[PDB]
């Protein structure tokens, strides 16, 4: 008889799941695993980022019970924990999603060998991704584009992404009964209490396949809306109803298919031909993950500056202070320190937002290293994703892709521009609520009366501003220029 495994890392689905539909052809008995390592934290992740996979795994067994299923957390690492449940369980058949993330290449190459000793099949589909990412490079003469204009004359001589896979059967084959390492008590979704966590998670973002699919279809009840879709139009101010899908956690926890996404859109564009073209449009965002997937599975050391072949080697400053006053959301420039605490409570800003406080810290006004920044945000983001958080932070700090070093954002004008009352900033600094418009974005500049009134004084309640922008940014971009220059 047929016993398989559908092991879970990503693709936290029950639609598009072709690694889930192999595992269920055919087979007598299904066991659903996901491997969580208990000793996590006792290593860096925030509890809102785990409490968010916690709550995708919680919506995945729901989907599993209500199909005469179960889904097992089983506790260990998985080269030690295979190995015994293949035998155990009778396992002829090993599924799961491909990923090209540099830890996952080891994790799975080591779990291959280990199916291959006891007998077992392994099958991984692509489904990650939009397309077979090493296909696309081998349609592009066996090497990755490193623009996104050549990225997308490549995707449109490829032609559309595979449709999603349908949906697994109504019943699913069952885990057997009485197997010692599927014992309930064993095998259920911990609570973000038990995994060691003291805080509790304060996102508005609940996870879960659930969750992603009502998101989704949030996002097209106006299809005009998703047909004219432009991303640098969108306001970065906007918390009430963010500007745009807030997809991007359920997309990196595979909760939603990329290719179910980029297959609504199409429908959509069909329809409405006067749609926005990449990369401005949202297949255009779709195409920017693609893109820097692409790029990064193919880059060695893609994380990091030194031997980064793609990476700009730059003289970054090592100023711890300058980065916990950024990191502790105490830069003295509300619009800085706004998006910084929606970062540690949310975990998750609108890109713009991004980009103001990673332009700051790098090579707008404190000059340190865009690595530093990506740690912050690899700690607090709900959609930390390996390859996207990289390349854009090396997009900020024009160390790869981008290389105009002489835009510079102000932290004072930025957002006055979207949020003149500044609603965005009472919202995440209350200490800021009665704080007169006028100087909202610049209440070091307020006269004291005001301050004392607002009940916030510079330098009692609110700190004062860590640099004056005018001198810090135009030392930055003096720097960077002689780096782009000392190079060749
Ligand atoms: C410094 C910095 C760090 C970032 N780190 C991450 C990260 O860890 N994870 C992450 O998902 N995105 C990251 N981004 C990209 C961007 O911030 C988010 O993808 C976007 O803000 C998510 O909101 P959304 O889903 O509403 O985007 P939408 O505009 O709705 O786009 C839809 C989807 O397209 C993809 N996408 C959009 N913009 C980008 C982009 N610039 N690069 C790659 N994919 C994109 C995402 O999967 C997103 O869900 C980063 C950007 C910056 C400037
Ligand atoms: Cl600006």
């Known amino acids: 008889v047929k016993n398989s495994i559908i092991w879970f890392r990503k693709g936290l689905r029950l639609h598009d799941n072709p ?14 695993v996901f491997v969580l390592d208990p000793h996590f934290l006792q290593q860096k992740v925030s509890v809102n980022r785990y409490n968010f996979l916690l709550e995708s795994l919680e919506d995945l067994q729901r ?34 999603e491909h990923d090209t993330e ?27 991704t939009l397309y077979d990412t090493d296909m696309l490079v081998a349609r592009n003469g066996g090497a990755a584009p490193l623009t996104m204009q050549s990225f997308t004359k490549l995707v449109d001589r490829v032609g559309d992404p595979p449709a999603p896979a349908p949906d697994p059967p109504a019943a699913m084959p069952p885990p057997a009964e009485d197997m010692p390492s599927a014992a309930p008590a064993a095998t259920g979704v ?29 996002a097209f009840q106006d299809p005009k809306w998703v047909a004219g879709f432009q991303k640098p139009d969108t306001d970065p101010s906007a918390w009430e109803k963010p500007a745009t899908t807030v997809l991007s956690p359920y997309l990196k926890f595979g909760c939603l298919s990329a290719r179910l996404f ?42 990091r500056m030194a031997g980064n072949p793609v990476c700009k080697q730059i003289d970054w400053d090592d100023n711890p202070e300058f980065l916990a006053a950024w990191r502790e959301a105490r830069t003295g420039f509300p619009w800085i320190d706004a998006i910084m605490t929606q970062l540690v409570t949310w975990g998750w800003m609108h890109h713009l937002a991004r980009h103001s406080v990673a332009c700051f810290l790098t090579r707008g006004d404190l000059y340190v290293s865009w690595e530093r920044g990506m740690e912050v945000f690899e700690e607090h983001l709900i959609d930390q994703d390996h390859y996207l958080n990289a390349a854009n932070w090396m997009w900020l700090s024009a160390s790869a892709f981008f290389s105009q070093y002489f835009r510079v954002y102000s932290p004072v004008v930025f957002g006055k521009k979207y949020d003149p009352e ?50 810090a940014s135009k030392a930055c971009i003096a720097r960077m220029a002689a780096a782009y220059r000392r190079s060749k």
Request: net charge positive.
């Open 19 to 32: 690694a889930l539909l192999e595992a269920c052809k055919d087979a007598k008995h299904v066991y659903p």
């Open 190 to 218: 911990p609570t973000w209490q038990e995994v060691g966590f003291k805080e509790p998670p304060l996102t508005v973002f609940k996870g879960g396949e659930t969750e992603a699919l009502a998101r989704l279809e949030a």
């Open 422 to 471: 500044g609603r965005f900033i009472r919202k995440f600094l209350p200490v800021l609520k009665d704080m007169p418009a006028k100087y909202i974005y610049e209440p070091w500049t307020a006269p004291l009366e005001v301050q004392r009134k607002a009940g916030c004084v510079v330098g009692r309640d609110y700190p004062a501003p860590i640099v004056d922008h005018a001198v």
């Open 102 to 128: 540099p830890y996952a290449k080891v994790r799975d190459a080591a779990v291959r060998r280990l199916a291959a000793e006891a007998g077992v099949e392994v099958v991984t589909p692509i489904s990650h």
């Open 262 to 303: 980029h297959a609504r859109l199409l429908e959509v564009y069909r329809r409405h031909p006067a749609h926005s073209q990449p990369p401005v449009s949202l297949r255009g965002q779709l195409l920017w993950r693609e893109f820097f997937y692409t790029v990064g599975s193919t880059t060695p050391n893609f994380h």
């Open 63 to 96: 989907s599993f019970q209500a199909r005469g299923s179960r889904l097992l957390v089983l506790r260990g690492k998985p080269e030690e924990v295979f190995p015994r449940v293949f035998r155990e369980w009778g396992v002829t058949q090993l599924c799961f």
